Amino acid sequence: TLSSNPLLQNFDFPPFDSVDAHHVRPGIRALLQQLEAELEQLEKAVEPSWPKLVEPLEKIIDRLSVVWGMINHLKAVKDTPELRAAIEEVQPEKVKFQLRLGQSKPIYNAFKAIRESPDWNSLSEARQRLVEAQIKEAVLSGIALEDDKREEFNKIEQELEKLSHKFSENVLDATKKFEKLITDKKEIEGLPPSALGLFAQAAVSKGHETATADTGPWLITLDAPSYLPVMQHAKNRALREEVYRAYLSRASSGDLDNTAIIDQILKLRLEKAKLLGYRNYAEVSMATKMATVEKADELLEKLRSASWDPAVQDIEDLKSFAKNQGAAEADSLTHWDITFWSERLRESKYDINEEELRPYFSLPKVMDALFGLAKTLFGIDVVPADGVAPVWNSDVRFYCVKDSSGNPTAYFYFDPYSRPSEKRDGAWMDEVFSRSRVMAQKGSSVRLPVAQMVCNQTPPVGDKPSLMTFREVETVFHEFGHALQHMLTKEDEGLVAGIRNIEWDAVELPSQFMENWCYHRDTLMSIAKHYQTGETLPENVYKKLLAARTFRAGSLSLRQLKFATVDLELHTKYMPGGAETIYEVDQRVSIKTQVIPPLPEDRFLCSFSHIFAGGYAAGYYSYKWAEVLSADAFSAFEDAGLDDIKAVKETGQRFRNTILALGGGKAPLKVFVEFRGREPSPEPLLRHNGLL
């Protein structure tokens, strides 16, 4: 009877129209039995050959991926509580099997044998990348350690996970300990209607039955949706100072302090690095990155240098502006004022009325322009293919991406319109199938890749089309660039195709790339035509759009560089338990990266959850790294001449055949240099943001 389950079928496109929640529990449990059985069959027959290792392994990997991705996609677009319940129940079993599969010593040893064979030197670059990936994944999880040190390793990992939770609880507890009840209406000046509703119902929840946004008893807290409005809008400088000092000192001292827990984490990370043979934990992280410690250190310093003079200007802009507005805070601005005064200056000079911007951005026009841009640049025709694949909502479109010669390269689904009953908000790209030699049906040489695009516009009603914000357009462009790398991959080795096996810090290249075209004049002014007037976007809106992009770039850059730099400092060159302390790192890096010096009491590290509780340890640089790559990749088109459409096609064709084509079967610095002609520069990024 499992025979009838859609998830267990051999399908050509996933059965999105026909899977219900009651199939999930039986089908995922059944699939996991099949795959567990097929893994054991694999392990009994392993040889260091493609047909006896990598091809069997891909088949397991791929089927779990495709099916799990199907049902998990249905949860984001066709959500029911029965479906959530079913997925949250089988998810642990799934992940236990994933763990099992990677821990396979027969498979590890077989890959190791591939690596050590003479045959290695005949293997293709992509196959070598694949093998090295499997080895490196296994090794860095400890599999290569001998049993005593594997136990030490596992004990280190376990204590680290404990410490990371204790870190996170200390921040969360220190965040929620602050409660400030305002009763005087004068003290609550400036705060928006939303914030006042929040703080009033925050007061109601703590007993103040009558509390109202208007009337008062407003309870202010240090959590994000309370903290942000206070720093941006509370005219009350005392309340701004209050909430600032509290926030920058969560977990700074007391029974709730993280300062020793940090040092513990950093010590155990060093023990982990040394068992794996690396000097420091940054070296371990960088073992799977495009960057290196030295190159990341180099880049971040380059950015910090160029960003600094802009950042001091940004402060003088505020002191100037607040003098104009007559505040006694001017000439005396410090931390709790900056967020506020920035917003005030925003509102004055750089502000764009998004209701008189929406009429110009109509969804069907936007998507046409996007697909036409993709034809111009990359040589592909996006063509309606509605009815080839089954669908979960009548509005979901299905497109074939055809190459220059008329053959399909890839297919994608598009789900445009918001359904807040059943559908997650926002926009995303997701993967349906990867491109694969192995997973091709008989007669075909490759299975073609398949992708999801999703967004969340209000559907068209009457005269009015689905209008978009500029930011929504920007996000659809970004997400289409992930989709394009997934779909226009030419790599047939399927564990390494698409975006698979692209080093984290390089993954956001094609996507951050595609956003640049939204600020490109001629592209934007082709899109931006008023749905009723016909008229292009007014030229003063365009100029303001651009002005807004660059606004506090130097201050912004420096803030990100604080985090990126302290993260590498702490994991590179700090000795835990040694001469210098955590706070001397905190202050020493803050001098280099923060124009107004920290107050004492400011302990930003004790709240820096990203690197102590989350997964960005020795990885926070990654944000700015990918930003550098994408800006620079765009400057190839700037150099070629953005108005010479032959030059844009030539440069785009080469992008198509590098960044988008090669997947993870070539190291990213090699792929980037193959496109760009040289190694990456921060100049373009700095120039586009106005810092050089």
Q: Measured from the CB atom, is 280 or 512 closer to Zn ion? A: 512
> Nearest Cα to 329, choosing from 319, 314, 339, 344?
319
> What's the min distance (Å) between Cβ of 482 and Zn ion?
6
Q: Measured from the CB atom, is 153 or 517 closer to Zn ion? A: 517
Token pair listed for 253: 């001292």
Token pair listed for 462: 């009457």
Stretch that binds Zn ion, among 88-96, 167-175, 192-200, 510-518 (CB under 5 A): 510-518
What is the rounded distance in angstroms from the CA atom of residue 118 to the CA atom of residue 114?
9
Q: Measured from the CB atom, is 72 or 581 closer to Zn ion? A: 72
Q: Measured from the CB atom, is 160 or 685 closer to Zn ion? A: 685
Check the annotation: does 197 bind a ligand: no
Residues with Cβ within 8 Å of 248's Cβ and at least 6 positions away in sequence, in order, are: 335, 598, 599, 601, 602, 603, 604, 607
Check the annotation: does 612 bind a ligand: yes
Count Cβ neighbours within 10 Å for each residue of 480-519 and write b for 16 or more, e otherwise: bbbbbbbbbbebbbbbbbbbbbbbbbbbbbbbbbbbbbbb
User: How many beta carbons lie within 10 A of that of residue 445, not counting itself?
Assistant: 7
Contact call for residues 6 and 19 (beta carbons, < 8 A): yes
> What's the min distance (Å) between Cβ of 507 and Zn ion?
7
Check the annotation: does 482 bind a ligand: yes
479 is catalytic: yes
Stretch that binds Zn ion, among 71-79, 190-198, 503-511, 608-616 (CB under 5 A): 503-511
Check the annotation: does 611 bind a ligand: yes
Torsion of CA 304, 307, 308, 311, to 10 degrees: -140
Measured CA to CA in angstroms, residue 398 lies from 106, 357, 389, 468, 488 at distances of 41, 29, 7, 21, 17
DSSP 412: E
DSSP H/E element including 628 = helix 622-640
> What's the min distance (Å) between Cβ of 518 and Zn ion?
15
What size, in residues, is the chain? 692
Provide the sign of the torsion angle of the four alpha carbons 223, 224, 229, 230, taken in this order: positive
Q: Could you say whether residue 565 binds Zn ion (CB under 5 A)?
A: no
Tell me the three state secondary structure of residue 450: strand
Check the annotation: does 22 bind a ligand: no
Q: Measured from the CB atom, is 54 or 427 closer to Zn ion? A: 427
Q: Measured from the CB atom, is 402 or 610 closer to Zn ion? A: 610
Angle between helices 105-116 and 125-140 (to 10 degrees): 130
Q: Measured from the CB atom, is 436 or 511 closer to Zn ion? A: 511
> What's the min distance (Å) between Cβ of 382 and Zn ion?
20
- Give me the residue whose beta carbon is nearest to Zn ion: 511
> HEC string of 190-220?
CCCHHHHHHHHHHHHHCCCCCCECCCECEEE
Stretch that binds Zn ion, among 179-187, 336-344, 506-514, 631-639 (CB under 5 A): 506-514
What is the rounded distance in angstroms from the CA atom of residue 450 to the CA atom of residue 473?
22
Q: Could you say whether residue 511 binds Zn ion (CB under 5 A)?
A: yes
| Binding pattern for the stretch 268-307 against Zn ion, x by CB under 5 A and - elsewhere | ----------------------------------------
Stretch that binds Zn ion, among 51-59, 445-453, 508-516, 678-686 (CB under 5 A): 508-516
Check the annotation: does 508 bind a ligand: yes
Stretch that binds Zn ion, among 64-72, 292-300, 509-517, 676-684 (CB under 5 A): 509-517
Token pair listed for 497: 């195709």
Check the annotation: does 417 bind a ligand: no
> HEC string of 555-594?
HHHHHHHHHHHHHHHHHHCCCCCCCCCHHHHHHHHHHHHC
Token pair listed for 460: 């068209």
Stretch that binds Zn ion, among 56-64, 310-318, 356-364, 507-515 (CB under 5 A): 507-515
Annotated catalytic residue within 58, 329, 479, 515: 479
> What's the min distance (Å) between Cβ of 333 and Zn ion?
35
User: How many residues of this chain bind Zn ion (CB under 5 A)?
Assistant: 1
Q: Could you say whether residue 452 binds Zn ion (CB under 5 A)?
A: no
Provide the sign of the torsion angle of the four alpha carbons 277, 280, 283, 284, taken in this order: positive
Check the annotation: does 610 bind a ligand: yes
Q: Measured from the CB atom, is 234 or 499 closer to Zn ion? A: 499
Which residues would be at the binding site for Zn ion (CB under 5 A)?
Answer: 511
Annotated binding site for Zn(2+): 478, 482, 508
Annotated binding site: 478, 482, 508, 610-616
Annotated binding site for substrate: 610-616
Q: Which residues are catalytic?
A: 479
